[PDB]
Symmetry: C2
Subunit: 70 residues, 2 copies
């Protein structure tokens, strides 16, 4: 199959230093795509963040603190 | 959490493709100078891919390379 969709990509960086990419698509039922540009791992989010982004426990909490905010 | 470095948006085209069995996502973005983002659903890993450049590294990777040549 091939499906195309126009979506808003959000590049974010905050300070460890983190640089994330956020893809908002309708295919994941409100869930957001979070791409870690430094570890090149991604996950669909609705210590799972630390495990799904390849990052230690409290780095994952800092990503989680940024993610629940937005 | 002392400093918020940046926060910018951009309209981008996302492709959902399906062809052992592979499920990929392709994000085209002006931020990466024409290089296409290739996401692997099953392995949850991605990479900024260009014609010049590893595939199985960053993502049975030889068959992914065959399909990506038909897109880029």
């Amino acid at each position: 199959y091939d499906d195309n969709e126009e979506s808003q990509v959000q590049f974010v960086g905050f300070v460890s230093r983190y640089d994330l990419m956020l893809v908002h698509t309708n295919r994941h039922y409100g869930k957001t795509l979070v791409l870690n540009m430094q570890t090149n791992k991604f996950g669909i989010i609705g210590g799972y963040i630390a495990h799904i982004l390849g990052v230690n426990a409290e780095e994952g909490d800092e990503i989680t603190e940024y993610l629940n905010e937005v």
